[PDB]
Symmetry: D3
Subunit: 253 residues, 6 copies
């Protein structure tokens, strides 16, 4: 078997990928999302009740479908990154990255020694399909994609430095965390926040990196796509479930 090709990673340079957030934290719900045709599915280990084992179940569900899996760990924790790579997550989204030094450590966390610090345990791992991918230890590093979130004042204060880190494939903007950091908690739609987001997207793309963002607002998402933003998540499974059930009830009250 050849290593699973990371089409998400390749498509960062060739197209604009439409994403769905997966916070239902469940192999069965993840399979439903995987049937829709999103370019990418974000398995949220930061803000949904997930652990390594529930994320594994969702990777197994999604694996039968073309949608590419991206996993967000709860934090930039090196041992947790090791665990998520070994269950076979090929793209990671690291929250709250705030310096070039932290971004460099996240690069190393995703690459084998001697160049990186990814723990070596291929025989045991779904990532190597238990060494059924015979040359995994030689071919792994190439299909791993590292995305980092800029979503605080300190992140924006270190944006140019992070954008200079070789091995950061993409910078994703978190409007909820960023709007709160800016003192507009719950109000990312404000011009003050939006002008900072647009400028940030322009700088990311000017430095030759992929830009990404989430917005459930159709108009904002289409604006970000018009700016050339490479990976745009356009909705959240929990939000779509709740809103669809509320809209239906409202027809009958």
């Amino acid at each position: 078997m050849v290593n699973t090709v990371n089409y998400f990673k390749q498509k960062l340079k060739t197209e604009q990928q439409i994403g769905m957030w997966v916070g239902l934290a469940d192999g069965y719900c993840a399979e439903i999302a995987a049937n829709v045709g999103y370019d990418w599915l974000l398995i949220d280990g930061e803000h949904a009740p997930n652990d390594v084992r529930s994320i594994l179940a969702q990777l197994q569900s999604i694996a039968a479908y073309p949608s590419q899996a991206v996993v967000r760990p709860v934090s930039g924790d090196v041992p947790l990154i090791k665990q998520l790579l070994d269950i076979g997550a090929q793209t990671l989204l690291i929250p709250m990255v705030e310096s070039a030094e932290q971004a460099e450590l996240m690069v190393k966390a995703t690459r084998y020694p001697p160049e990186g610090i990814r723990g070596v345990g291929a025989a045991l791992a779904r990532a190597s399909r238990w060494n059924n991918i015979s040359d995994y230890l030689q071919t792994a590093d190439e299909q791993i994609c590292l995305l980092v979130q800029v979503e605080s004042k300190k992140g924006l204060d270190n944006l140019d430095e992070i954008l200079n880190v070789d091995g950061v494939d993409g910078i994703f903007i978190g409007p909820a965390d960023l709007s709160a950091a800016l003192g507009y908690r719950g109000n990312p739609g404000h011009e003050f926040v939006q002008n900072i987001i647009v400028q940030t997207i322009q700088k990311i793309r000017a430095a030759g990196k992929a830009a990404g963002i989430l917005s459930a607002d159709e108009k904002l998402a289409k604006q970000y796509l018009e700016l050339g933003t490479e990976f745009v998540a356009v909705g959240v499974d929990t939000s779509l479930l709740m809103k669809s059930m509320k809209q239906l009830l409202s027809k009958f009250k």
Copy 2:
């Protein structure tokens, strides 16, 4: 503690209750549905991948909310009915009921000896809150609600006989199973099927029983409500999730 009052059962005689089908088979998804404000939630043990333990988890989630839980077992199995009553399901929907003799057996399955055949194990049961409902064995039978599905030719052939069974609180019409039985599989919207459904609702209500049905078609559901149908399910969580995610993607293709 006094036994949990079955408001679903009481409301069969005082109002028209709006229902949501719950097939996501998960305590977390069931809690999301429970926040919307449906009069009743159908935990589907027949067509969703549920067992006694997953149904228990969903009852625990839903219990903090006003929405009344109704459980559909996979079949009219007496021992399975015993298990679902003991985890505390107070309303059951029995699929594919086809005779007065079967309906009478389902009545007995929901009531303690000496009048019924419900196995006695109160001490162990969430139903008695582990005997924290001190008079459970005396007050249980009153808050249990039995609904039976008529959804085959043999069911329609025994409709008058089933409607004469004391202890059947409601007859629910299954348009998917009924349309297939009638040789209109996938096409319940056909006038042939709909005239049989309308006549069936009229007969159920004429015999003094509650009538129920599921339709995701807003126009049909409102027609059934105009006829006086007591319990109408108007949508399905899996369908709402899938359709909402597809409609969103279609805005970006």
Copy 3:
């Protein structure tokens, strides 16, 4: 490896075994019970929310401890008996047995062909420790113990016939189900019920079978032990947990 010796089965002829009911339905709770020193633990698949997989977990927990495991299935279902024997349950308690013909079928359900109807799948089974017990198919039948419950009027109406069935090792009296059947639901302590229980114990022992019962009433349990009842359950984990937490709170209200 030699087959696990069923010490419960042997001790039916040599001593009076003290039992604890396990309805917490959980490997961790079952292990707590296993540390106490009960002769036998009843893993309740009839009145606690258990399935084959949760019963397996509890058998695995208990297996490190001297306490002997007895499993109650939800009903005398032949395929479910097959499943519980293959996960390695060596003693089964069948509820609501009401005829010699049903007791004979339960005997056959526990024994391999050609003499019985137990499905043969030893290679796959914890029962054979995956053929690590090399002679399992020749030695299995001997360590299997069949107990049947008499707990209805029809059971009492067929008591002499059931007591004549070769392969029934024990008859257990269910006071909750029996008192309800007799029209004393919730009141097994009444003289009418107790005289029937004592007479039933005497008849069981007179026919050379082991007699069993559950009572959380210390005086009744000690009375049953004085009559020579071979297997007496003296409490229930859910009941002891609830009562101990209530008694503690009452000291502080």
Copy 4:
């Protein structure tokens, strides 16, 4: 989406399919087996500790790989067959089939009304991918494969009658159950048993049905393949795990 094509079913007429028994009862273990390249994987719901939900997890794991999944339910139970079809099992292996009447009922259990009795609940089902397979109710019956086990004297006594049932795609011989039924429990390798198995394979193929069997004996499996047996399972995951770990320890004692 078009309905998933049942390549197992088509290949019953075009080649000899090599199978692996999956009794480890776990999505992660099922995925390991799925990487090997077996034509088919038997998810054992009869002799491994599986339920609908654990079988679902294994179907989800296996679905990303070419290996075709076959599910054995604990018995020919119509409602359980309904559940296993709805989670998306397209091939079923029914144990202990003993008459034309039982085989006909298993045929109906796998087909929608009006011709069959399969319960209609497509909207909710992984089988329809929650109606993402738009014409599922018209195209389902064609990709369902029914296999029945002949593995008792009564099965052999009704072999010609079972072989005349339209809708039975395959007859599988169970050497463990059959050798026990014949009074050679644990000794299927005996000439008495083997001549009956060979004769049975010849009769199955002469009636135009697919023949199947399990043997972990390489010589017996190759003999069955030389006779033209269409679906041959050649090993069991639990057995291969135990034997490989024992053989390794023996090198070091």
Copy 5:
């Protein structure tokens, strides 16, 4: 929906709240405890085998009952605090707090930016009921209660400094950890330890903070209540289960 009111937090200034430790690590056991009527239930993520997902299940069980849930994470880990707040834990008990600097960080960990560092992910969170609490991001901080444990020499060495931290609602004394730190491991009942505990309770209350403690000793618990201690846990579910089962067996040996 308005944000769930934290009655535990309000009652810290109006009454003395009686608590039960919940270490059975299970939604079903947590529900049993929730029926008793304790003012508060401590879901132990430090010394019972719990993770985010098992703590979620227990919050869901408890949510239907008046008992207020308090969650102890394994350590003062900022990302784990984020996870436990998002599943809807409104009161946290942080173990082994040893400085004003660590207590200040725990305050920030529980509050949204710009004043705190709680990660913003309301849409996804049971805490917001998936934005069904429409103003959650404005009303969340007010219903969050922060308790910190002083249970080491360094904690006692920094007691006055911790008691001056705005945002610490309560200091809880850990007699097991504290007695071990003092070189009286397993002997918290010693006068040396008890005089330090009493002095510590007096200092906590004199600084205007709530004092808390656990003791399964009825006399010690009543002494702590007489001193005015605001939140007193009086027992542990695992201990009450084990002791009740041992005391029962001892009546029969």
Copy 6:
């Protein structure tokens, strides 16, 4: 009850113990391994998808068998070490230990105050069997065994310093991590790596500590045993399962 004797720890001074790696992450798979007769089983929390709760399940399975359990946490995390000790893991293997200061902290992490920093919560813990081991807090430290991995250049750079730490019972060499660190990723068999491993084994034993290693290569494992290496793992369950299923299929292709 007296504390469980750690026979693994005692046998480090009396014999050479043969080990099996357990990465199938499952109580049922762990029990299969437990039946084989390995001296020790490594429950891998670093490179298999395990958490505290799945490791607990595997400890419960294994506990009925003579095989000694060793648990590898994901990293030398003090709170996670506390959790694994409380579920009753008596031997820990800490990955990627690189200094005397880190080894000393791991020693303290495994011992109660006042000498160590192990959090005290015995009442709640399977480790004390919920205080059924009445003197657990006095007898625990003696049956705890600490192993550390040297598997990086920094580890080898601090080998003499680590070997001087009182309370390190064993140093385990990780050939996958070490060969990668040395720029021979995937090629530990090279003479450059092997000479370093042999020298390292000699230095460990010369300092009076137990030496350990894993090799699935029978010749290398036997060479390590001839050098007197005290704890040698000779295979991995995932590897043996995959290889045995592949070898079987190759006989039939």
